[model samples]
Target: VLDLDLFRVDKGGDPALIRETQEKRFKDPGLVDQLVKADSEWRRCRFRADNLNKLKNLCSKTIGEKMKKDESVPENVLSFDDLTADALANLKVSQIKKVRLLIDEAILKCDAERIKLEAERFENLREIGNLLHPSVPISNDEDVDNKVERIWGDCTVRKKYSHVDLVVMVDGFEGEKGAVVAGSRGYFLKGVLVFLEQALIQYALRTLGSRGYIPIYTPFFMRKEVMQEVAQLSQFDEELYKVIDEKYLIATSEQPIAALHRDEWLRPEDLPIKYAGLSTCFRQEVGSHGTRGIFRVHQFEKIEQFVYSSPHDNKSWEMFEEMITTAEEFYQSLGIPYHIVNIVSGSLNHAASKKLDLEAWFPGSGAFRELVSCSNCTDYQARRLRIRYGQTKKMMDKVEFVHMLNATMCATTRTICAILENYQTEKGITVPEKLKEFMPPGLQELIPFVKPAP
Candidate 1:
């Protein structure tokens, strides 16, 4: 849920700032004005209903006490000003009942309008994206608009060695068999490739664990309620795979990890909670235009770097750097050419204040494709999850939402794609030196298999 207090002028909220961000993101700034109007209308109706209830209660109490005394009551006290305590002393029991009923009807009408306006206000608020960071590039096109922060390693190789062809040469991927049984974008990993993926997962876990990230295996399925708190609600249809029980298959460990501390209160001393989340994530792949390969698939194992930090100061931004650097180091150690891209405001998702992408050079795809996304959500997710922290003295009395950050440590299939494409030779695919320890002795190099009779 967005903090609606931001739209309240009485709360010292700057509506202009929200409007500015919406404009920068190429969204309609008028939505912010609509939100303000809807909110004020709701508040106005709420106050009217509350005042009416109080008046009805007071009138009923006064009438009860006056009648209890057996005082004579008037049948013609028509106006509210004339219906004071002494005036009520002039009303009959039936007249007092009529006045109370009329007040109740007004209260009911006000409450109905208030509820309707409340829903309208929330809908408008939800449509707006997060406030953009000053550094976010202002552009409508994502591919051409994103600013490249830096490039690393050699990107000069022109030899065309596709991962799909390389995997087939090594007899590692069962694409046809997988597609026949499981449908499009499905594949089975075979022989050394299976071990290669496991090595990547283990390598990522150990790398982050040594740097203080607690290893966690997140659940693959999430309840719709929890999912909405972490991801954009509309993604439920666009990206999520729904199960029969109203639960959805998680698109990333980031979703389940964000919900891990839902409605929780943390001590300020225990500030940044870091987790190296490992999970096999699933996606619907709906309405997507990315080229077909294992790179964009239905399911893949991934290691995510997720952090929950204090809202005070710039702690979340610091975590953002730490996460992206770790991801860069992982690629560097694997000897993959890559570059860092600062995602433009128009390309950012609802939860991110700012985002960076670690795009590895894929010789197979002949492009620098996105391998990891690092984001600093800046209390947006925490506000929705109600995950907060406060000083020890005011532990339960006062709490502020904790800032959240997430980055991809490794997406196994894509990394494998990078490795196969970048390290290919005519004999086989040369394995990265760092991953050798995790693989079997004979599996140091993947050699092409001579097909046997079926």
Candidate 2:
């Protein structure tokens, strides 16, 4: 939901820029034209209707005044005539009543047409995506033309165990049993894998907590209405899992946390609200292929960085950089090799004006895979949720929507996969130093289970 002002040229909106953004994403720029057309048509009808309504009210008032002890009729309804006063007054009353009825009918028809045009204009407006940042590279396809920002750690290591095989070697996965009971993409983490996941969660939460992020545990599910504000409407079929009620299993902690301040006004002093959200997430993970093991799973634990900042003077971008650094530092602490990429325009989600992805190196596949997604949504989600900030509650007209940003701090299962593949050895998986304290005492490595001879 972009600010409506963005479509109004009188309000400083750039229709040409919007058209360029749409064309870059391979979307029809004609939608912008459609919006403008409907907007003008709606406004025209409203203007006429309002004037006619005013005329009808004036006639009704004149009727009452004329009836007041035969007072002189208003000038607008009077005429120069030599007829008797009673007949002239009766004739004037009849003419005014007739005109008022006609005006009332015209007002009703104009209002109905305006209502239709308003709906059409609104539909077109919401269909448009967020305005792109100028730095975002133009790309027809999302997977192409992404600019690599930076790379960390060495990627020259030779082939090693895949996380799938490594988990089996360590006897830490119940893949077959889980599939039989819970369906595809389901698995049980046994022995050390469970503790390792918990360690990652604790490490991510505390790290951000120390950096001024309020550690919040959000609900696992959210109402559909609220979810629509934070996620793309198309995601209902592709990413979310809907239950019996009008509730959905959240795809990430961002969903619930984004809705935390829905329809609320914040004090200007609380300009920036940083939250480290910890939660269990569920996803349909639809249309995926060749993503095996826990890499693309139905459920996982994640710690997300979500922030609300005033949409003034590039405050959201500042928060975006802060969030990205936090994610990079967390991964660096684990000693993982990863590269960051400035996602292309086509690659960005509906709500994000700009985004960056931290792709971790996987020795087993010899490829960089996504570990974190950091996005500056600007005021897209805030406008939809009606979250605003103002100097004082009395100054409703001065309030403006806040900007929103989100970044992945750690996704437990995927991080565990990265660790298994990156730090694997002949004996076991070595624990990263930062996560050691959270693991059981004296357990520095996750040793493979060796079955005794039967």
Q: Over the stretch 241-276, how does candidate 1's per-residue lDDT look in tens digits?
A: 888858989999999998898888877788788999
In order, what lDDT does every prediction score?
0.82, 0.81
- Clashing residue pairs, backbone N/CA/C < 3 A, model 2: none
Q: What TM-score against the true fold does each predicted structure earn?
A: 0.92, 0.89
Name the candidate that leads on lDDT.
1
- Alpha-carbon RMSD of each model: 3.0, 4.8
For model 1, which pairs clash? 73-90, 74-90, 74-91
| Alpha-carbon deviation at 437 in model 2, angstroms | 1.2
Among these predictions, the greatest TM-score belongs to 1
- Stretches of candidate 2 above 4 Å error? 58-99, 392-398, 449-454
Q: What CA RMSD would candidate 2 show?
A: 4.8
Over the full model, what C-alpha lDDT does candidate 2 score relative to the true structure?
A: 0.81
What local lDDT score does residue 11 receive in model 1, on the 0 to 100 scale? 84
